[PDB]
Amino acid sequence: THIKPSAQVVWPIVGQEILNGDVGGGFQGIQITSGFFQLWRASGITSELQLYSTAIGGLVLAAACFFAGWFHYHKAAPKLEWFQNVESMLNHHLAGLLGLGSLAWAG
Amino acid sequence: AHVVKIYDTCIGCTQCVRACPLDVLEMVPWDGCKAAQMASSPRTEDCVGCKRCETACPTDFLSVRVYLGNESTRSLGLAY
Amino acid sequence: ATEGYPFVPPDWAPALFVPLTGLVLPAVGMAWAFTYIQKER
Amino acid sequence: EIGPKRGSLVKVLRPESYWYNQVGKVVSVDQSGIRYPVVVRFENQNYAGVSTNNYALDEVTDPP
Amino acid sequence: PWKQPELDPDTPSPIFGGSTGGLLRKAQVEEFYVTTWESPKEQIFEMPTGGAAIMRKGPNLLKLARKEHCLALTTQLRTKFRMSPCFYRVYADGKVEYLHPKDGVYPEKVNAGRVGVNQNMRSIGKNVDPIKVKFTGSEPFEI
Amino acid sequence: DIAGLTPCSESKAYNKLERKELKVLDKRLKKYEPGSAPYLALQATKERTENRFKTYAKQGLLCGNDGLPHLISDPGLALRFNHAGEVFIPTFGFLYVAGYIGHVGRQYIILSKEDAKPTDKEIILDVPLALKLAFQGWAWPLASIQELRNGSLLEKDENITVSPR
Amino acid sequence: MKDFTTYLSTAPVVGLGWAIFTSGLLIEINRFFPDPLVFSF
Amino acid sequence: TKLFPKFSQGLAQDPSTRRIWYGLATAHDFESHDGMTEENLYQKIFASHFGQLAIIFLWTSGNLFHVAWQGNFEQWVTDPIHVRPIAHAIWDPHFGQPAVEAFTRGGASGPVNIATSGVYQWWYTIGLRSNQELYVSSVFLALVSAVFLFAGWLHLQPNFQPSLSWFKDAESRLNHHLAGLFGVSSLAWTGHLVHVAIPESRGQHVGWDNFLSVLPHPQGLTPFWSGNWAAYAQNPDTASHAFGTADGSGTAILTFLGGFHPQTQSLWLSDMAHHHLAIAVLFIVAGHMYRTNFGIGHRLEAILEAHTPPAGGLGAGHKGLFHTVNNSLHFQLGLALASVGTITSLVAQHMYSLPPYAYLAVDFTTQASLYTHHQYIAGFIMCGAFAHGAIFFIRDYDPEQNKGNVLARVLDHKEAIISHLSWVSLFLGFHTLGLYVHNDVVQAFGTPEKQILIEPVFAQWIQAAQGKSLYGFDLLLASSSSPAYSAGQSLWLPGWLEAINNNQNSLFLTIGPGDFLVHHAIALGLHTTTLILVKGALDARGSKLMPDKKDFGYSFPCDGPGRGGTCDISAYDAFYLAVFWMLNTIGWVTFYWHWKHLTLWQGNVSQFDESSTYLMGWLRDYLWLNSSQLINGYNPFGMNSLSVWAWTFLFGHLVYATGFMFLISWRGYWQELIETLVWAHEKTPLANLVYWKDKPVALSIVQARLVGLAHFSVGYIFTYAAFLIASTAGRF
Ligand code: CLA
Ligand code: CLA
Ligand code: CLA
Ligand code: CLA
Ligand code: CLA
Ligand code: CLA
Ligand SMILES: CC1=C(/C=C/C(C)=C/C=C/C(C)=C/C=C/C=C(C)/C=C/C=C(C)/C=C/C2=C(C)CCCC2(C)C)C(C)(C)CCC1
Ligand code: SF4
Ligand code: SF4
């Protein structure tokens, strides 16, 4: 209630030291507006170590997704009938994606 | 209506008459080109001035020229 | 009057002249122009 | 026979042409006596996108 | 063509529902256009002003408000089913005009039977300046 | 003391602006402990501000009625009075680089136009030749002068596309 | 490497290499030297 | 077939709504009218010029009548510094009870409108004192307007219609207009000044009853017939002189003191008296130059053909140009509009610095409105000059008539001129925006000393050359040893130096780096507008994209989507895009004038000096600080006198927004929307009985550009006029 959120720190290169505003808590930087501190307080997150672990896991999953795109195009590309299975796509993205994510977040 | 004129630079590619969706242009025999064809515009009063023939014209400059002015009930593309 | 002979208009003239040129003269203008445009030869 | 040599570079002096005061390569010259028998090809396209055009005998000269 | 054909009111029409795109009051006070084609079977075509309709096996009749609609339908039919159709023009007083195949061989051909019209033997850009034709009533390209 | 402008060293408004900046910078110093990284950054900012205010003074700089330094643009007036460093030498400093860029671009344009299908060289650059011209453009004015003199810089209008008016 | 270095000589050699070089160059002049106004060497 | 476009039979055959708009738009384009010759065209232009003269005289007669009727001219005469001018009374039946109560300004009874046109100061300076004289002026100007009406009708009947060659008589026209329209007209004006205004400023009423009984100078024309012209400049008005009474006055009719009146802050009456007398004499002398029926004189064709420099400097020189200017009416129109716009700019730049009317400088809002009005008028007139020059180039330019002359040679290297204009415009804009953004982001970082403040040494050097001793440049006219100061040291130097060394007036204000930066912005706007207008004029008849532009008329929409796309390819669209740049440029010059003068009047010139450098300071201290009183015209708490200006402000915003409506969207989507509306009207009950006679058709592309430009311009003008007069009238 007294310390403004801040998650972007500018460099002291040219006149930007005035942009590192006194957001409180012995810290200076850009007062952020995305509400990420509120989200990281909703999901139980205490230290910056857990944020570091989340960042590393996100980078790993991003590399996995890029490798998945490369594989699913260049290496093993699905046929047209695979994409035309609309019922399977709807079932797997209703029960699987949305429902499994909702259950995992509830847990 | 509008004025559509065809100059002697035409070489008879007979594609300006395909690009015109109003049957304004026609192909007549000629002797000034290798293809022995020349664009002619008998139904000039039916033209709206869409300049599709000028787009389809390959000669530089354009053999078929369309000049705007004196709009009518057929040159304005009016169905009402 | 002391040389009011370059005739001074009355102090009630706006009440007659403003609606005359705001309501009647535009009406005559629209009617005359609309008769002009829709005239076949 | 009546025009420039095939494959020789010529200069176009037609004012309304896109290639006025430009150099083009002759690809064919018609011998049937037509209005614009000289056919040339230009390395740069016009605004319409074409690269070839036809000119008369008096509209082509040897560039210096 | 060899003989100019007259349109027949007895030819049927393709099956189509009510479309708001179609004939207007201009079809009454002014001229309107009628397209005629012969089909070997029942096919589905898209109207230039509406949705999709099924043509009849044989002669067909379509009434369109503009000549551009008729030629768009003609080009669509020629590209799709090589129909080679023809369209007319019916005036308000009942006069029927023949427009598209005047020679019967389409504007793409020549037929060696049509004269040159609105053709300038001079080059484009060799026209005189507007000062030379000022106060004359004739444009430089109209010479 | 030209154009009614006092020197920056002997200007009261310049010192007023300096002490106002020092005051507003020291206002933020009271909210951090002296052994903190934001305190170190603010101290570095204050040191940079003091160094800038010191170096702008006694450097042939003038300011008038506002405390903000002014620049003298007329050459000659920047020569007899010590003001050439404002715009006189940096004009040639910019012009050298501008002619460098133009000359290396011109060299690449000529050396690419003499190659088969030369339109691809603009989207597909070559690095060795462009770097060779990049390190050969130091003497751009001499090359430009000699090319103007021999006539290869310009081209005959006869060979230039001209609007047909 | 031939196919890769043919791609690397397209748009990023002029859009990224020049941009990064000229930028970071100018950043380091503006960093190591303070903000100048008069060219007094 | 209709008959509303009687001038255009083809337009009357148009069955759509486009016929009305095109007939209104091509109303006075006589060169494109059906079946019209040159002589009838010239006679029609003569009658039209008579009509505009009658309209102008009727309008100024109405101004006199309304000021004499509902104004406070007598109260303004008694107290000019306190009593405000009144333009006309307000009779709006939609007004509320507070609205009537909030517009009885100037010590009036009913709702009145405060006059900022400057006619009160002008009429007080020229000797008009009572509303009786203004009434007589109004009725006389109405009479001469009727005379011009009858004369315009007179030169349309047979045996009275002038021939074509009468209009083409150039030498006699120039002789007569320069001798009488300028010379003897200025002589009559300085005679009126000496007879009426000089005694009326010294408590001596001169009217029609007694001007033959009073004498303008105590010597009485003896100096004029003799040589002793210095008797007129013997006893001028002293410094402690009142413009209404004869307190400390003198008997002088022609004097050259210079400077300003110490009380009225305006130029001396004897100064402008000798000015108009000298101008009259010089113009009458210059009016006896060109060749007429007598054996002496100058021939314009001979001078044009003779001025061909040797060695082919200009090729054929000005050979063949006399027939080019005489035959082409658009050339003469463009030259006249160019000179008129340039001299309107000169009038705007010289009125505020040298006020010729008593107590005009005290009225700040009036001076601001006058400057803004005449500057926008000048910009529009210059845009019209370049547009009509383009019309000359495409319509009636004959290259074989003048081969190798200056015109054909300029058209030959038109690409070089356009490219160099593009270079200077691009360079000015690049570096001006670069320095503005640099200074603005430097001021953002809390270090305003790092901004680039290039001192305007050139213009300050010029000001010191004119006698301004503030900058310390001891040049000529500022040092006592210079010959320019010694020459005229006893003529007008003590007045001019006293007026130019006083910073309270607007004569040669002190200029800082922000002044120089906004001057460069002004030069950028002028250069870019010149670039686009020049490129449109030179490419009006031919281009590499379209060589046959001369065959398509001056105002045609496009050539189609072929050859890449040819939208806005005509010179008409070049003018249409140039009007935006003209509006932006005059907006820049008026922003500069208004902010500098507002900071001068409020006394904080340092605020403008330290705030005009960066654009954020410009915005905050001009468009935000000065708009506080404007938008408080009608609060929910209450309404004041500035309620009309806030409504006009939002009105101009709305009209500018409708200009955007016509400008962004283009015709072709509106045609389908209108077609759907046509189907809606044709296929509904109780409304298909009512049917249009003109077919509804969307606005043409040229028409779309015209209406978008028109809405944009009127909205621009109205919102800026509202803001300017509200910010200058809210405080003073
Ligand atoms: C053309 C210049 C001009 C303009 C813009 C105005 C503007 C105004 N006048 Mg004024 N007026 C003028 C000239 C003008 N006047 C002249 C010359 C006279 C003396 C004959 C008057 C006599 C007059 C009276 C008596 C009254 C106004 C009023 C008004 C206001 C309401 C508008 C109105 O009713 O029109 C005025 C309508 C009239 C019929 C009078 C004008 C007669 C015209 C000028 C003669 C016709 C000339 C020509 C054929 C048509 C002119 C159009 C032309 C400009 C294109 C408005 C502020 C009224 C008001 O409330 O005062 C503020 C009012 O009561 N006017
Ligand atoms: C001492 C020798 C001398 C000199 C210096 C001149 C000088 C001049 N004479 Mg000449 N003259 C001389 C002897 C001389 N004269 C003699 C002995 C005779 C015989 C009696 C003449 C007869 C003569 C005639 C008959 C004429 C001249 C003219 C001229 C002028 C133009 C010359 C020219 O070709 O245009 C200069 C050459 C050009 C190619 C013009 C280029 C202009 C560029 C393109 C414009 C650049 C615009 C630029 C953007 C502006 C930027 C400004 C910025 C604020 C934006 C020039 C001032 C002409 C004149 O009166 O014009 C004023 C003319 O008609 N002369
Ligand atoms: C306020 C808005 C605005 C601005 C800034 C411009 C700016 C410009 N217009 Mg204009 N224009 C505008 C509104 C505007 N226009 C409108 C509303 C119209 C009516 C349609 C026109 C009509 C118009 C015409 C008809 C013409 C221009 C021309 C020009 C140029 C004039 C040359 C100049 O001054 O130097 C340059 C001025 C600048 C402001 C430079 C802008 C570029 C800066 C440096 C940023 C560059 C990118 C930056 C480094 C960041 C990189 C990353 C980023 C790209 C993502 C310039 C590019 C003329 C032209 O282009 O010919 C030379 C021209 O003929 N304009
Ligand atoms: C229950 C099974 C399941 C799940 C969970 C998903 C999940 C997803 N699919 Mg789907 N899909 C499925 C089965 C499934 N799919 C089936 C059976 C078919 C064929 C009928 C398809 C066909 C299909 C198409 C055609 C497309 C998708 C896409 C997507 C993504 C949508 C983007 C989104 O909402 O952001 C949610 C994003 C995240 C949660 C980020 C994490 C993503 C992780 C790494 C994915 C893990 C789920 C995966 C099924 C695990 C097994 C893969 C295994 C081989 C390693 C999402 C990741 C879109 C896509 O390409 O994105 C990949 C897309 O266009 N799906
Ligand atoms: C290096 C190539 C090059 C050269 C020598 C020129 C030279 C010229 N141009 Mg051109 N220009 C170029 C590239 C170039 N231009 C590019 C890429 C563009 C597109 C953005 C333009 C757009 C342009 C316009 C719109 C105008 C000019 C104008 C001019 C003239 C004024 C000088 C100037 O600084 O203009 C200013 C030039 C610019 C603002 C363009 C800057 C773009 C960068 C710096 C070019 C990058 C090229 C690259 C570094 C070369 C590759 C190097 C090689 C080793 C690989 C001059 C004839 C003006 C004119 O006609 O005056 C006579 C004019 O109005 N130019
Ligand atoms: C005294 C100078 C003068 C003269 C004699 C002419 C005369 C002519 N010009 Mg020129 N012109 C002038 C000034 C002048 N104009 C100015 C100042 C401009 C710049 C704005 C132009 C721009 C211009 C262009 C671009 C063109 C002409 C054309 C014409 C011709 C017919 C125009 C006409 O009457 O249409 C009558 C027009 C109308 C009745 C429309 C009036 C709508 C106005 C202009 C918009 C005003 C905005 C708004 C609605 C005003 C009311 C505000 C509201 C709140 C009350 C004629 C040869 C045209 C031509 O030669 O044809 C090819 C042409 O293309 N001129
Ligand atoms: C398009 C065209 C046109 C138009 C144009 C224009 C519109 C222009 C304008 C122009 C302009 C607008 C110009 C201006 C100019 C100016 C000047 C040229 C000035 C000068 C000045 C001076 C020379 C001064 C001097 C002085 C004195 C006297 C005093 C003080 C000092 C001094 C020394 C400064 C025309 C019609 C022809 C036709 C063709 C085409
Ligand atoms: S498109 Fe042009 S060149 Fe081709 S056949 Fe038609 S008129 Fe001739
Ligand atoms: S403008 Fe259109 S309708 Fe007219 S002749 Fe050309 S292609 Fe046909």
CA H444, H449, H450, H456 torsion: positive or negative? positive
| Three-state SS at A63 | helix
| Three-state SS at G40 | coil
Separation in Å, CA H590 to CA H355, H374, H583, H597: 18, 11, 10, 10
Using only C-alpha atoms, what is the Rg of chain A?
21
> Strand pairing partners for H112?
H89
Residue whose Cα lies nearest atom 15 of ligand 2: it is H309
Domains (ranges, CATH) in chain G? 1-41 (1.20.5.510)
Residue F88 near residue F79 (C-beta atoms within 8 A): yes
Cα–Cα distance for residue pair B29/B16, rounded to 1 Å: 15
Ligand nearest to the CA of H135: 1
The tokens 């102008």 sit on which residue?
H56
Cα–Cα distance for residue pair B23/H442, rounded to 1 Å: 66
Decide whether any atom of ligand 6 lies within 6 Å of the H450 Cβ: no
The tokens 């951090």 sit on which residue?
F32
Cα–Cα distance for residue pair F109/F113, rounded to 1 Å: 6
Cα–Cα distance for residue pair E96/E94, rounded to 1 Å: 6
CA of H621 to the centre of ligand 3 (A): 25
Task: Name the H residues in 107-126 with CB < 8 Å from any E CB.
Answer: none
Q: What is the Cβ-side half-sphere exposure of residue D11, based on CA atoms within 13 angstroms?
A: 11
**Residues 6 or more apart whose Cβ sits within 8 Å of residue H701:** H557, H558, H666, H667
Which technique was used to obtain these atomic coordinates? Answer: cryo-EM
Cα–Cα distance for residue pair H170/H292, rounded to 1 Å: 10
**Residues 6 or more apart whose Cβ sits within 8 Å of residue H697:** B76, B78, H16, H17, H18, H671, H674
Judged by CB atoms closer than 8 Å, whether chains meet at E125 and B79 is answered as no
Cα–Cα distance for residue pair H98/H641, rounded to 1 Å: 10
Instruction: Look up residue H618 and give its two tokens.
Output: 């410009």
Judged by CB atoms closer than 8 Å, whether chains meet at H695 and B57 is answered as no
Question: What is the DSSP pairing of strand H112-114 with strand D38-41?
Answer: unpaired
Best residue among B53, B54, B62 to mutate for probing ligand 9's pocket (most ligand atoms within 8 Å of CB) is: B53
Instruction: Look up residue F140 and give its two tokens.
Output: 């751009």
CA E77, E81, E86, E89 torsion: positive or negative? negative
Give the 3-state secondary structure of chain E.
Answer: CCCCCCCCCCCCCCECCCCCCCCCCHHHHCCEEEEEEEECCCCEEECCCCCEEECCCEEEEEEECCHHHHHHHHHHHHHHHCCCCEEEEECCCCCEEECCCCCCCCCCCCCCCCCCCCEECCCCCCCCCCCCCCCCCCCHHHC
Cα–Cα distance for residue pair A22/A28, rounded to 1 Å: 5
Taking the CA of residue G1 and the nearest CA in chain H, the distance in Å comes to 39
Separation in Å, CA H315 to CA H292, H409, H432: 30, 7, 38
DSSP string covering H198-253: HHHTTT----TTTTTTS-SSTT-SHHHHSS-GGGTTSS---SS--SSS-TT----S
| Three-state SS at H375 | helix
Exposure of B2 by Cβ count < 10 A (0-12 exposed, 13-18 middle, 19+ buried)? Answer: buried
Helix or strand run (H / E) with residue F71? strand F69-72
Helix or strand run (H / E) with residue H647? helix H643-664
The tokens 């006589």 sit on which residue?
H30
Taking the CA of residue B56 and the nearest CA in chain D, the distance in Å comes to 9
Cα distance between the two ends of chain H: 60
Q: What is the DSSP letter of A44?
A: T
Using only C-alpha atoms, what is the Rg of chain B?
13
Residue H726 near residue H639 (C-beta atoms within 8 A): no
Q: Do you know the residue count of chain H?
A: 732
Residue H390 near residue H537 (C-beta atoms within 8 A): yes
> Strand pairing partners for H695?
H16
Contacts of D16 in chain H (CB under 8 A): 547-548
The tokens 């709006």 sit on which residue?
H92
**Touching E: which chains, 3+ CB pairs < 8 A?**
B, D, H
Residue H18 near residue H670 (C-beta atoms within 8 A): no
Contacts of G35 in chain H (CB under 8 A): 447, 450
User: Which alpha helices (DSSP H) does H243-363 contain, by range?
Assistant: 269-286, 300-306, 321-327, 329-351
Best residue among H53, H58, H145 to mutate for probing ligand 1's pocket (most ligand atoms within 8 Å of CB) is: H58
Separation in Å, CA H653 to CA H434, H710, H719: 30, 14, 6
Cα–Cα distance for residue pair H405/E139, rounded to 1 Å: 27
**Residues 6 or more apart whose Cβ sits within 8 Å of residue E57:** E39, E40, E41, E42
Best residue among H88, H119, H147 to mutate for probing ligand 1's pocket (most ligand atoms within 8 Å of CB) is: H88
Q: For residue B1, which amino acid is it?
A: A
Contacts of G11 in chain F (CB under 8 A): 123
Residue B32 near residue B9 (C-beta atoms within 8 A): no
**If we measure between CA atoms, which residue out of H455, H414, H708, H721 comes closest to residue H549?**
H414
DSSP string covering F1-51: --TT-EESTT-HHHHHHHHHHHHHHHHGGGGS-TTSHHHHHHHHHHHHHHH
Decide whether any atom of ligand 3 lies within 6 Å of the H524 Cβ: yes
Separation in Å, CA H540 to CA C33, H422, H543, H569, H661: 36, 17, 8, 9, 28
Judged by CB atoms closer than 8 Å, whether chains meet at C37 and H91 is answered as no
Neighbours of H312 (CB within 10 A): 11
CA of H412 to the centre of ligand 2 (A): 19
CA H189, H195, H199, H200 torsion: positive or negative? negative
Contacts of D15 in chain F (CB under 8 A): 164
**If we measure between CA atoms, which residue out of H469, H494, H492 comes closest to residue H479?**
H469
Q: For residue H201, which amino acid is it?
A: S
Instruction: Look up residue F74 and give its two tokens.
Output: 């007329």
Spell H163-185 as b/e; 16+ CB within 10 A means b.
eeeebebbbeebbeebbeebbeb
**If we measure between CA atoms, which residue out of H585, H610, H584 comes closest to residue H596?**
H610
Using only C-alpha atoms, what is the Rg of chain G?
16
Residue H532 near residue H584 (C-beta atoms within 8 A): no
Judged by CB atoms closer than 8 Å, whether chains meet at A13 and G35 is answered as no
Separation in Å, CA H711 to CA F80, F123, H652, H661, H719: 55, 44, 9, 9, 12
Identify whether B61 is preceded by a cis peptide bond (ω within 30 of 0).
yes
Residue H608 near residue H599 (C-beta atoms within 8 A): yes
Nearest 5°: phi and psi at H62? -65, -35
DSSP string covering H524-537: HHHHHHHHHHHHHH
Neighbours of H291 (CB within 10 A): 17
Neighbours of F94 (CB within 10 A): 11
CA of H253 to the centre of ligand 8 (A): 80
Separation in Å, CA A10 to CA A29, E4, F41, F44, H701: 7, 84, 12, 15, 50
Instruction: Look up residue H653 and give its two tokens.
Output: 């915003």
What is the Cα F146 distance to its own chain's centre? Answer: 27
What is the Cα A52 distance to its own chain's centre? Answer: 12
Please tell me if residue D23 touches chain F, with a CB cutoff of 8 Å. Answer: yes
Separation in Å, CA D56 to CA B39, H296, H326: 20, 56, 39
Spell D2-14 as b/e; 16+ CB within 10 A means b.
ebbeeeeebbbbb
Judged by CB atoms closer than 8 Å, whether chains meet at A26 and F45 is answered as no
Q: Among the atoms of ligand 9, which is closest to the Cα of residue B16?
A: 7
Contacts of A27 in chain F (CB under 8 A): 38
Residue whose Cα lies nearest atom 3 of ligand 9: it is B47
**If we measure between CA atoms, which residue out of F142, F147, F143, F134 comes closest to residue F104?**
F134
